[PDB]
Amino acid sequence: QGPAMGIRRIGLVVPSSNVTVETEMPALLSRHPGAEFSFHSTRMRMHTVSPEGLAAMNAQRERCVLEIADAAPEVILYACLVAVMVGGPGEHHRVESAVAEQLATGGSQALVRSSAGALVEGLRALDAQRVALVTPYMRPLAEKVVAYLEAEGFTISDWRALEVADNTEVGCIPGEQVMAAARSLDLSEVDALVISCAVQMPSLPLVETAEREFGIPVLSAATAGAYSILRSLDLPVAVPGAGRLLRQDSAV
């Protein structure tokens, strides 16, 4: 198509209290052998992962979009997965389209992705039908994630909810806790494990060790987001250290 772009600019629309995605996204993508990235954030305030915390956070969408658009990123990621999925089946399409339209009214060419939509995208690239989930959420929010994915055609075999409503606390969840949850799952005939549905719960270093342990593909909201960003930018998905999903273009 056109001239090689140089540094690829990624926009991140993130909960104010989130520290994990701005850490994990650069760490994961820094291992791309053929592309360089920069990361630019806008904050929507949230510290409590509850219906009301998420509603208050989502209401800042229009503000955040105008802010990050000013940076002319190539793709913009709506980072919080449950923020979208709490709105019920189909919500990522409504949110993504609302962002695209707002960007278009301001003359921006930026692409739009969301963690929720990216998870679907990653699960489908994996040819996954039966899926198991680990989440830091309170149970009712976990159940909405489950219902969302069922509507997209997935069978959710089993899931865990750590019930950690405070987002700062979510960021401090140790890998041992996450691994203990993943190990409590029944994984028989599960095609893929979502080791973290939330972008605040750390999981990146567990992805490789968990694939070796469980013998299935392992992804998170963050690795799904990375996959989606790569696909949106027409870049090869061949990044080491981030599970099978990030090596889909290995043979290429």
Side-chain angles (χ1 to χ4, degrees):
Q1 197 72 244
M5 205 101 268
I7 317 296
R8 316 304 291 273
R9 268 58 158 95
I10 307 317
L12 304 171
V13 180
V14 308
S16 53
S17 57
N18 187 297
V19 296
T20 305
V21 80
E22 291 161 307
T23 310
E24 281 186 353
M25 202 64 70
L28 186 165
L29 287 171
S30 78
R31 306 203 53 193
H32 199 289
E36 221 61 52
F37 304 92
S38 73
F39 300 88
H40 311 275
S41 300
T42 172
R43 290 184 129 67
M44 35 178 45
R45 285 195 73 197
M46 177 274 274
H47 58 277
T48 306
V49 185
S50 67
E52 198 34 67
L54 273 344
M57 190 190 75
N58 287 326
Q60 298 293 317
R61 179 178 51 62
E62 285 192 3
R63 182 189 47 83
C64 293
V65 170
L66 283 171
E67 285 171 17
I68 197 54
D70 287 350
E74 287 189 63
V75 215
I76 289 155
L77 183 73
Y78 200 86
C80 185
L81 176 144
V82 76
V84 175
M85 288 189 188
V86 73
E91 188 69 22
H92 79 272
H93 296 275
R94 273 179 290 279
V95 173
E96 294 179 18
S97 152
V99 181
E101 177 176 323
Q102 183 179 0
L103 294 163
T105 63
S108 174
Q109 313 303 312
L111 272 24
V112 188
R113 296 293 181 276
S114 60
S115 293
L119 187 54
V120 174
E121 194 177 346
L123 288 170
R124 286 190 215 267
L126 253 10
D127 295 329
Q129 165 55 221
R130 268 145 299 190
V131 181
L133 314 171
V134 182
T135 79
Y137 312 130
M138 300 307 294
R139 297 180 87 268
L141 294 182
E143 247 151 6
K144 287 193 172 287
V145 174
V146 174
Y148 197 97
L149 259 12
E150 280 169 337
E152 299 286 347
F154 301 108
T155 302
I156 304 302
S157 293
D158 202 1
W159 51 275
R160 296 292 178 268
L162 301 176
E163 314 183 77
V164 184
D166 181 276
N167 215 34
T168 301
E169 191 175 350
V170 175
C172 292
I173 294 171
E176 282 166 67
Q177 199 182 343
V178 181
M179 281 312 291
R183 284 197 274 250
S184 75
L185 291 167
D186 178 38
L187 293 189
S188 58
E189 48 213 48
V190 164
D191 300 323
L193 168 66
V194 186
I195 191 86
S196 174
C197 291
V199 290
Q200 178 74 330
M201 186 175 74
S203 67
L204 181 55
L206 309 175
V207 174
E208 289 289 331
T209 41
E211 282 190 346
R212 291 291 77 71
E213 183 172 341
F214 302 127
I216 57 170
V218 173
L219 67 168
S220 57
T223 67
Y227 177 80
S228 187
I229 282 162
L230 285 178
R231 288 269 179 243
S232 78
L233 293 175
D234 264 285
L235 254 7
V237 357
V239 185
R244 261 195 265 177
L245 171 72
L246 272 113
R247 301 192 290 269
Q248 290 305 286
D249 294 337
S250 57
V252 195

